[PDB]
Design a protein around this ligand. Structure first.
Ligand SMILES: [Cl-]
Ligand SMILES: [Cl-]
Ligand SMILES: [Mg+2]
Ligand SMILES: [Mg+2]
Ligand SMILES: [Mg+2]
Ligand SMILES: [Mg+2]
Ligand SMILES: [Mg+2]
Ligand SMILES: [Mg+2]
Ligand SMILES: [Mg+2]
Ligand SMILES: [Mg+2]
Ligand SMILES: [Mg+2]
Ligand SMILES: [Mg+2]
Ligand SMILES: [Mg+2]
Ligand SMILES: [Mg+2]
Ligand SMILES: [Mg+2]
Ligand SMILES: [Mg+2]
Ligand SMILES: [Mg+2]
Ligand SMILES: [Mg+2]
Ligand SMILES: [Mg+2]
Ligand SMILES: [Mg+2]
Ligand SMILES: [Mg+2]
Ligand SMILES: [Mg+2]
Ligand SMILES: [Mg+2]
Ligand SMILES: [Mg+2]
Lengths: 49, 185, 51
RNA sequence: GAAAUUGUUGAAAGGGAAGGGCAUUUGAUCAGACAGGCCAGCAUCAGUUUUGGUGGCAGGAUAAAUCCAUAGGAAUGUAGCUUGCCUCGGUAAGUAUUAUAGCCUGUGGGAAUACUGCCAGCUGGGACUGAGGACUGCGACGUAAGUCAAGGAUGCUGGCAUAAUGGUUAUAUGCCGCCCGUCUUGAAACACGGACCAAGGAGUCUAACGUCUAUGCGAGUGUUUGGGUGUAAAACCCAUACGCGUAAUGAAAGUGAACGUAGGUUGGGGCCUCGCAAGAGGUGCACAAUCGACCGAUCCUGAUGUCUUCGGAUGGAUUUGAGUAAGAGCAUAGCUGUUGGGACCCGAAAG
RNA sequence: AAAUAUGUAAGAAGUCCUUGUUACUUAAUUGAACGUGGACAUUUGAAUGAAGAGCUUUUAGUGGGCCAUUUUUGGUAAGCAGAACUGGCGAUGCGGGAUGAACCGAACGUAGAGUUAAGGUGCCGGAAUACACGCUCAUCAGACACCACAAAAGGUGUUAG
RNA sequence: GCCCUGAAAAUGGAUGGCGCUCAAGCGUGUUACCUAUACUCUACCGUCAGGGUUGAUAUGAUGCCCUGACGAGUAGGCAGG
RNA sequence: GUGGCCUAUCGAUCCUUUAGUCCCUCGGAAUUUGAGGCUAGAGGUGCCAGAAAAGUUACCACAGGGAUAACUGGCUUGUG
């Protein structure tokens, strides 16, 4: 995630270079940082999909 | 290599500009391009796209159609918006006192609206009065009443009009159209 | 305009993950384990060495 | 006064073709800036990557072993002992389980190391890249001022300023490269056309049409048969007709499109009301599906009245139409497609 | 009586309650069909994905095919003839199989750096005349899929059982 | 198992060639290394898609600018020159 | 119960002819014959989505075809 992590925003591939973009797209699920995204993956949480 | 699930370099398939070279029409497109970008009003986006339509996609709207729409509940004082031509209809004998904005008015249509106490305005005048389409009513004419449509989808048991030049007794009413001559469709 | 990889650019590693400063300060990557002296039962050892 | 083709002169290459592609050497030739142009060296950074040294942790039989303590056992039997030949000590086979060597198995004790994994541990060498061009963002280090490796390279220095770099061209060297066009499942083919060069050489125009698009006017539309007029095949102006459209349906005689806000239901953009928003409600054009109503045809029902055979009111029917249900068309132009014409160009044996 | 293929379903056009219409149906407001009114929101009814979904008009070329793995018919067989599913060639270069339309790898804008695929690393030829345990001596050894062949039957040659 | 007998065709001849015998052969195991128009990162060209920007006083709103993805092709279609 | 227990047992346009409706037309106006229409069948195309059709060329012609036979060559080897 740190090296090759890109997000899908408006059908576009955007690098995850700051926590602001993650919050703006996954904040409604409680994910607001790159570590929150990692936590949701390693522990398969309610919002894994 | 990439396994493509869809066609690459595919155009959207919608017109982004009018095909005509009318200089005055381009000015209206420039006005509503600015409004659609900086108003987030759904009305402005609809009007801008309607300015790109071809002639068959903008059927005429008669004054009788305008009068019928004004008879709707609560629509008596709304401004009728037609992106196209408004024609006259002599089959109706009473007309309201509404305000109509359209690209073009025929001589009969303009006279009938003014005689009833209304006014005919252009689309740029409408933008000044209602920049966000306040209290407007958009009317579109009928597309499937065109003569070309009745020939589309021709085939057995389809009930469509054949493409024929001369119509009469001896023109495509024999075998294939009646049971006494072979079969019926 | 240029993707800078964290874990090789320390400044970018600090912009994300404000806990990296605490992780390095207390040496969480070399944390020792508490010593325990529990031993396996005889049945486990005999089964392991059984033919 | 072009090309095919040829003479002379000059330059270059040539061991069973020649010609070509990528790269550079050599020869020849040539443009650009000298107002910072050409080529380089080092340092500090950013991006990508390659190859070493080194540190701290975790796991397993909490590695297994080694090592240490202890019990038992055996031989490919150590010391000792017996036995027979033996160039006065060397073998040979019996006994003998640690003694003057040792080994194996079980149990107990404490570590190390291997293997695998982790570190938001540290650090050396090499290569490629420098996109962007005022500021804006997110962070770091600091009491603060500020600084910084934080949304893309700067600093210092040297040589040369011209054929030195580079371009062009000929040649050489390394590797690669079969003759194009055509029909074909398949062509370098022992399949066909082509010795060479120049000029010429093949989807055109017309009548009538389909879809789409542009333009004018719009329930209408079309001035150009003709007339008027003229700066005279132009431009300008115009009456009456006619064409198409505005009604359909029957073989025909014929008849001929509102029970209703021009119907109901479902989905609908936009607009309206309220609401911070999300939403809810109202109205809903175009368009899609469906149930009805209306007009013509077909099959039935047959009222008041009568030239007693005419007339066809009213009500129906798993029937039928290229219909109605607040009109959309007419004219001109363009690409594409269709048919008749020599019909993309050249070609029969015949009549 | 399999395996592989194959139909349908997994909700708002849904479920529940009450009662309106009819010339159909029932001994009978009984039922059938379509409705009025009320309640139930998107962990609203499995998973994954979704370069957005739906729809219309018009026209080009084509209508000789062929090959490979698997299934399979005729035939002694065929680089023979004929079918089934899929992938290919035709229409396609590039790395590999010396060479080849179809095999293997991988599909292609112009460049730089790094890493690989299939295949290879004595010399031609870029890369270990590397490491490890065995086997084989041929007076016609052997050497890598498609693939460019070899059998029955034999040997106190040698090796293991 | 390997090797040998069985094993006869016409120009001269082909594990690709040279050559190779504890192999440079056969079976098997472990590492290092070589190189595609494939993969990763960067630049540039074009195409497509989603966006920003009309404010006068300086010229192209078919302008300028931001972001992401993509690029084989006969018969054939369309577009810009 | 809308032919044969089920799975086959069959036929357009033009023309002729029959049945039905006794209805429509013969266009200057009528009556009667005649003819022409409307709805449903029959007469048949078996090359069965349906031209009306005998040979010969060793006197021969043209457009083509290696989409296809009469030699080699290649694959195969039944047969020899
Ligand atoms: Cl060369
Ligand atoms: Cl009639
Ligand atoms: Mg002269
Ligand atoms: Mg000459
Ligand atoms: Mg040079
Ligand atoms: Mg070659
Ligand atoms: Mg052939
Ligand atoms: Mg060829
Ligand atoms: Mg020929
Ligand atoms: Mg010739
Ligand atoms: Mg010429
Ligand atoms: Mg001729
Ligand atoms: Mg004749
Ligand atoms: Mg072909
Ligand atoms: Mg080969
Ligand atoms: Mg080498
Ligand atoms: Mg080997
Ligand atoms: Mg292309
Ligand atoms: Mg019977
Ligand atoms: Mg029966
Ligand atoms: Mg007469
Ligand atoms: Mg037939
Ligand atoms: Mg042939
Ligand atoms: Mg035989």
């Amino acid at each position: 995630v740190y090296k090759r992590g890109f997000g899908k925003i408006n059908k576009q591939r955007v690098p995850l270079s700051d926590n602001a973009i993650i919050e703006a797209n996954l904040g409604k699920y409680g994910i607001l940082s790159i570590d929150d995204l990692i936590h949701e993956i390693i522990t398969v949480g309610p919002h894994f999909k | 290599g990439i396994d493509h699930t869809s066609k690459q370099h595919k155009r959207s398939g919608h017109r982004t500009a009018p095909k005509s070279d009318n200089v005055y029409l381009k000015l209206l497109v420039k006005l509503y391009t600015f409004l659609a970008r900086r108003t987030d009003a759904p009305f402005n986006k609809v009007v801008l796209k309607a300015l790109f339509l071809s002639k068959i996609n903008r059927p005429p709207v008669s004054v009788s159609r305008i009068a019928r729409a004004l008879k709707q509940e609560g629509a008596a004082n709304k401004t009728v918006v037609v992106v196209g031509t408004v024609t006259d209809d002599a089959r109706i004998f009473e007309f309201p006192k509404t305000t109509v904005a359209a690209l073009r008015f025929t001589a009969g249509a303009r006279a009938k609206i003014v005689k009833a106490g209304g006014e005919c305005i252009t689309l740029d005048q409408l933008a000044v009065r209602a920049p966000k389409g306040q209290n407007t009513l958009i009317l579109r004419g009928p597309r499937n009443s065109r003569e070309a449509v009745r020939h589309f989808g021709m085939g057995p048991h389809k009930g469509k009009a054949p493409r024929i030049l001369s119509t009469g007794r001896k023109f495509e009413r024999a075998r294939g159209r009646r049971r006494s001559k072979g079969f019926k469709v | 305009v240029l993707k800078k990889n964290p874990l090789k650019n320390k400044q970018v590693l600090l912009r994300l993950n404000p806990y990296a400063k605490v992780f390095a300060a207390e040496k969480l990557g070399s944390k020792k384990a508490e010593k325990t002296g529990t031993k396996p039962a005889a049945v486990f050892t005999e089964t392991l060495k059984h033919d």
